Amino acid sequence: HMEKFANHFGYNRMFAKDQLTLGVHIPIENYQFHAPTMEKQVELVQKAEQYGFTGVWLRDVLLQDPDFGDPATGQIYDMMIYLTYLASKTEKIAFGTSATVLSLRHPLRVAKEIATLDQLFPERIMLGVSSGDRRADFKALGVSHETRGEKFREAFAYLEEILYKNFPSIQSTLGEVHGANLVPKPSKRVPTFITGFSQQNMEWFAEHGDGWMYYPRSPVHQAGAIGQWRELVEDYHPDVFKPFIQPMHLDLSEDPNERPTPIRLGYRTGRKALIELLDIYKSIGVNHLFLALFDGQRPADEVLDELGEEVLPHFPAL
Amino acid sequence: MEKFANHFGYNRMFAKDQLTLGVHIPIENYQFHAPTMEKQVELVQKAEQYGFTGVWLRDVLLQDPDFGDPATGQIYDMMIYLTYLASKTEKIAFGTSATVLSLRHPLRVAKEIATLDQLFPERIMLGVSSGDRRADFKALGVSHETRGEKFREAFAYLEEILYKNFPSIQSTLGEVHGANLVPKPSKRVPTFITGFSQQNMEWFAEHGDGWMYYPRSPVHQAGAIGQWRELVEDYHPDVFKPFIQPMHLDLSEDPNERPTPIRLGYRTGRKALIELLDIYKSIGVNHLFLALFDGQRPADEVLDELGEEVLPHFPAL
Numbered sequence A: 001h002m003e004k005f006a007n008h009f010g011y012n013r014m015f016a017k018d019q020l021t022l023g024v025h026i027p028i029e030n031y032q033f034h035a036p037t038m039e040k041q042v043e044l045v046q047k048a049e050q051y052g053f054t055g056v057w058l059r060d061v062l063l064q065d066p067d068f069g070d071p072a073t074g075q076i077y078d079m080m081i082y083l084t085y086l087a088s089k090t091e092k093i094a095f096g097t098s099a100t101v102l103s104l105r106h107p108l109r110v111a112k113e114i115a116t117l118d119q120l121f122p123e124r125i126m127l128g129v130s131s132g133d134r135r136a137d138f139k140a141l142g143v144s145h146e147t148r149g150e151k152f153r154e155a156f157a158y159l160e161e162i163l164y165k166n167f168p169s170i171q172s173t174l175g176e177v178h179g180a181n182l183v184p185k186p187s188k189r190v191p192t193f194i195t196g197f198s199q200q201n202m203e204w205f206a207e208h209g210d211g212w213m214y215y216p217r218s219p220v221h222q223a224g225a226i227g228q229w230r231e232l233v234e235d236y237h238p239d240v241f242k243p244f245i246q247p248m249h250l251d252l253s254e255d256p257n258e259r260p261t262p263i264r265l266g267y268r269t270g271r272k273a274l275i276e277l278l279d280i281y282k283s284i285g286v287n288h289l290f291l292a293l294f295d296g297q298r299p300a301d302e303v304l305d306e307l308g309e310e311v312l313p314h315f316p317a318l
Numbered sequence B: 001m002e003k004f005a006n007h008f009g010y011n012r013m014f015a016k017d018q019l020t021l022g023v024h025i026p027i028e029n030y031q032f033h034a035p036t037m038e039k040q041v042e043l044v045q046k047a048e049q050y051g052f053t054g055v056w057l058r059d060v061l062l063q064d065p066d067f068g069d070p071a072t073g074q075i076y077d078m079m080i081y082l083t084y085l086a087s088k089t090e091k092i093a094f095g096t097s098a099t100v101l102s103l104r105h106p107l108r109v110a111k112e113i114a115t116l117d118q119l120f121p122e123r124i125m126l127g128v129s130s131g132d133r134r135a136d137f138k139a140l141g142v143s144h145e146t147r148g149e150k151f152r153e154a155f156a157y158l159e160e161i162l163y164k165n166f167p168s169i170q171s172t173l174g175e176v177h178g179a180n181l182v183p184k185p186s187k188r189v190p191t192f193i194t195g196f197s198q199q200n201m202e203w204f205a206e207h208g209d210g211w212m213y214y215p216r217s218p219v220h221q222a223g224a225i226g227q228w229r230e231l232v233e234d235y236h237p238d239v240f241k242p243f244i245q246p247m248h249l250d251l252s253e254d255p256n257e258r259p260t261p262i263r264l265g266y267r268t269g270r271k272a273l274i275e276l277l278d279i280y281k282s283i284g285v286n287h288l289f290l291a292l293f294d295g296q297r298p299a300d301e302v303l304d305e306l307g308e309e310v311l312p313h314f315p316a317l
Helices: A009-014 A041-051 A079-087 A107-120 A135-141 A148-164 A202-207 A219-236 A271-284 A300-314 B008-013 B040-050 B078-086 B106-119 B134-140 B147-163 B201-206 B218-235 B270-283 B299-313
Strands: A021-025 A055-058 A094-101 A125-130 A170-172 A175-177 A192-195 A211-213 A244-252 A261-263 A266-269 A288-292 B020-024 B054-057 B093-100 B124-129 B168-171 B174-177 B191-194 B210-212 B243-251 B260-262 B265-268 B287-291
Touching: A009 A021, A009 A094, A009 A125, A021 A300, A041 A079, A041 A300, A055 A079, A055 A288, A079 A094, A079 A107, A079 B078, A079 B106, A094 A107, A094 A192, A107 A125, A107 A148, A107 B078, A107 B134, A125 A148, A135 B174, A148 A170, A175 B134, A202 A219, A219 A244, A219 A271, A244 A271, A244 A300, A266 A271, A271 A300, B008 B020, B008 B093, B008 B124, B020 B093, B020 B299, B040 B078, B040 B299, B054 B078, B054 B287, B078 B093, B078 B106, B093 B106, B093 B191, B106 B124, B106 B147, B124 B147, B147 B168, B201 B218, B218 B243, B218 B270, B243 B270, B243 B299, B265 B270, B270 B299
Parallel strands: A021 A055, A021 A288, A055 A094, A094 A125, A125 A192, A192 A211, A211 A244, A244 A266, A244 A288, B020 B054, B020 B287, B054 B093, B093 B124, B124 B191, B191 B210, B210 B243, B243 B265, B243 B287
Antiparallel strands: A170 A175, A261 A266, B168 B174, B260 B265
């Protein structure tokens, strides 16, 4: 367990104790209140790669839901399909799901699809998993939202048997396997991160999964949780490192000197204070932080250039 | 009537009384052992160069020893691998043979197909079926016995979620009332019933855009094609719907060698293959896709021979 990802390329480039690495959230577009055009995503993902970003993150959403307040509906395109597309256009940057909804996607399909992605793009796949909250998706798939916490635990256990075992015995409320086997298998373990609380208690995501991803919070607010969580990780698996990940909305000011101002799910700031912010996050124990540029006042292309030229050298790929 | 009048992939592949050729993934003669999956991008690119109009994949989750399929479809997930191969080609159509509607939720099928058509406009053929991998049914908790019922239900849901804005759908599979599917395909997606899918002929004459059946000899296949078309003429007068056929091929070094049977196809030299394909064309086959899994020769060299010598006789439309 201490050596779990010892020779995992994507993992080691992204995560190390006391180090922070930077990622980007699809859509790389400042669409704000309107639907994204989805233009230039390939070029922008390639630039993010050149600049030394270590991860590109997608979301898992089926239906456009007027109740939900997400004009992007994830990124319009199906998560797995679009992840495949963008990964096929780049050489080394990691692609991560934020998050694969285990109560809405059958664990066997998750396993099959992740295993094939890891075969097509070895050691470049990060699996963020959650219990889900797109009410319209639940309703359309005929899955109960109320018992998603139970379904999540059941799905997670099934996902790990079927991904990593040769002809396992699986008796589950989700299905049965006695005599059949998953192919392909991923070449190495796939780093699997619990997203949010996923209706579990902290004990649970200390003991299961390979790390924790939580919502954008101020560093004062986040430090406590990271600390508690790591104490529990230390109880259950002494001397292992498990990384902490979080998203952040950024509205990067034209003026490098503009002061850091809290906005919805992140900060409006100039590059100087952003660097300061990220160093703070790094010190409280954040290991990878990925930037959502959706609400920025400047086009994402210029913001991405400024970040790559001025910010990434302070938080380089490992 | 003019349903696919301006659909690039459909019109390149399909026309009344014409036949085009396609190829089955894995393009490899793996025979009894699991395929290495090597060189698939190269070969699909060559297939495109040569004028094959479509590339086909199967929908299989688990390796099941009792099924007798060393490839387990093509090892990789169909949707993911299709995306990948389509991302490396410019124009050849990709087809599912077949998307199992009793095993994939119609909403996921719609989302994935609509995404694929957005990324690769007019290059996606949706072959659709009620399924036969028992181990998949078990593992997914779906009853095999009732798959025909589920197929009709899923098929209906699929066509409402794909093509209606803010539809109102009540189904045993779930409900849409208020929400909407993004993205949508930019044009209708050609959708084909494969096998009988536990339906009767009248059903797949009235539903879908065409029919794909199993490897039969031309004599054994001709009757079904004519019957089906007659029913198709009953429900939608003057509309053309294509018939699609897979076939296994063991292409002999010797171009003069006459056909002998192999499982699901023929061992044959190219000269007799061309003859055979003309018969298929005359009984009403519009697309035939070749599986090279069991050939004695490696697939690259067979592909070149087909490309250079057989494809000019059955060119892309």
